[PDB]
Structure formats: structure tokens, C-alpha cells
Amino acid sequence: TQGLPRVIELFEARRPKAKAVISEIDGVVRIEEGEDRLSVFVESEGFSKEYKLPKDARLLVKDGDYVEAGQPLTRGAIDPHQLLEAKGPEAVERYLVDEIQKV
């Protein structure tokens, strides 16, 4: 359990230790792995951006799936600033409040 240090981690908006990753744009998910490291490509009409992922960490999105902006690709806590610059302010409010209340 994360607990009080997590509450502090939230109220201070501090970089999560087990940082998940979020899509900066809206596009399809194309998973590519030769066996070295894992790469997850969020690709769209005008933009193609790839995410470097460690082979060990697991993810929430199967290949070919649609992802909204700021939608977490991997499992873990989410860096507030990232989703602020991704999804926008209201979603940040929602996440912060819901996590504090989760604890």
C-alpha cells in the first residue's frame, strides 16, 4: 500500500517512482519487439511517436488498440505534470483527488 507517503507524493506533485507512460496524442497502438527492449508506437494521421519501454514492465494496451491523449500505456502511478501537458487541467484535478481519496 502506498499510503501517507503517497498522499505527500500527490500534494507535492512529485515524480512517481514507478512511472507509467501516457500518450501525448490520439492514435493507434502498434507494438513492436525484436528481443532487446520493448517499443510501443503511438501513431496517428499526422504524427508518429514511439515509446521506449523496458521488457520487464507490463502494459494495458493490446496491439492495434485506440488510445486517447494522456491515456496510460503501462501500469503504474502517473506523473501529474505529464498528464497536465497531455490531457489538460480538469483530468489532473480528477486524478489527484481520486487518488488521495483512494488512499
UniProtKB/Swiss-Prot annotation:
Top-rank taxon, per record: Bacteria
Recorded family membership: Belongs to the RNA polymerase beta' chain family.
Record note on quaternary structure: The RNAP catalytic core consists of 2 alpha, 1 beta, 1 beta' and 1 omega subunit. When a sigma factor is associated with the core the holoenzyme is formed, which can initiate transcription.
Role of this protein: DNA-dependent RNA polymerase catalyzes the transcription of DNA into RNA using the four ribonucleoside triphosphates as substrates.
Record-given protein name: DNA-directed RNA polymerase subunit beta'
Gene transcribed to yield this protein: rpoC
Residues of the full protein shown: 1253 to 1355 of 1524
